[PDB]
């Protein structure tokens, strides 16, 4: 899988949900060989209120089974660490891929944070 990542703004507009969460578990094939899923602990939700969420409705993020076909690969040491996951909703499930904008919240500039929290929406429709 090869790809051109999105700018954070495009990541925000085209995604269905822009959640903030922590990776709770290692990848496991759920009810399909095609996708692997990560159990996640959702803290803050910046987008996708047409799917609720609150603090524990989205508990799994899906991605393809194998990297070659775009599966996302997460490898952090501290599980309480927080990430910004901008993803789509196939069915009612959050999907992520190699290109999906996923970065630890803490690494995010103050500007990017402000964009996710308030300003990116402003540029989406036009």
């Amino acid at each position: 899988c090869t790809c051109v990542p999105p700018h954070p703004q495009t990541a925000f507009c085209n995604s269905d949900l822009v959640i903030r969460a922590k990776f709770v578990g290692t990848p496991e094939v759920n009810q399909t060989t095609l996708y692997q899923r990560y159990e996640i602990k959702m803290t803050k939700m910046y987008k996708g209120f047409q799917a609720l969420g609150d603090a524990a409705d989205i508990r799994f993020v899906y991605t393809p089974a194998m990297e070659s076909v775009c599966g996302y690969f997460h490898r952090s040491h501290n599980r309480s660490e927080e990430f910004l996951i901008a993803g789509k909703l196939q069915d009612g499930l959050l999907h992520i891929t190699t290109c999906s904008f996923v970065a630890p919240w803490n690494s995010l500039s103050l500007a990017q944070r402000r964009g996710f929290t308030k300003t990116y929406t402003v540029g989406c429709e036009e």
Partner: protein, 168 residues
């Protein structure tokens, strides 16, 4: 493999491939150039050989598609995911598909078909994504200016040769 089909490496050196259909974006003859130049990148570093076919099933079935296209991974329209490929093996394995919704170009003014094919073919041969940003097998399309000075990362060489050996 253990659950999904596929093998770590091709159990033969002489592979065959086919460019199933073409993208309007670029003149048929230019696609052939990109794909072939692509494949050569790996032949130089291994004893592998590639023979083009025009009928029947080749190992590596190269093709362009949009949105839904047969396999269980539809393409995402313009942007984001530009292409995907499968590991060595029977059937759909080794194959490489390309997102037509992208602007395919043979130059540094769009998404360079060569660059992407070179990457995808690495998967058809048994390679995985690299963390080394300088490595071709890095998934994030890093588009380089002058194409003439394109070079493989040592890492890819060590990678592909640890499988198929260096040229004899």
């Amino acid at each position: 493999f253990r659950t999904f089909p596929g093998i770590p490496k091709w159990r033969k050196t002489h592979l065959t491939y086919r460019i199933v259909n073409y993208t309007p974006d670029l003149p048929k003859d230019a696609v052939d150039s990109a794909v072939e130049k692509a494949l050569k990148v790996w032949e130089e570093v291994t004893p592998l050989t590639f023979s083009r076919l025009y009928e029947g099933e080749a190992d590596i079935m190269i093709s362009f598609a949009v949105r839904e296209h047969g396999d269980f991974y539809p393409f995402d329209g313009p942007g984001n995911v530009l292409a995907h490929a499968y590991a060595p093996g029977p059937g759909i394995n080794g194959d490489a598909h390309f997102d037509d919704d992208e602007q395919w170009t043979k130059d540094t003014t769009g998404t360079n078909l060569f660059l992407v094919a070179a990457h995808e073919i690495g998967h058809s041969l048994g390679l995985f994504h690299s963390a080394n940003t300088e490595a071709l097998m890095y998934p994030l399309y890093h588009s380089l200016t002058d194409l003439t000075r394109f070079r493989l990362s040592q890492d890819d060489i060590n990678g592909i040769q640890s499988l198929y050996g260096p040229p004899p």
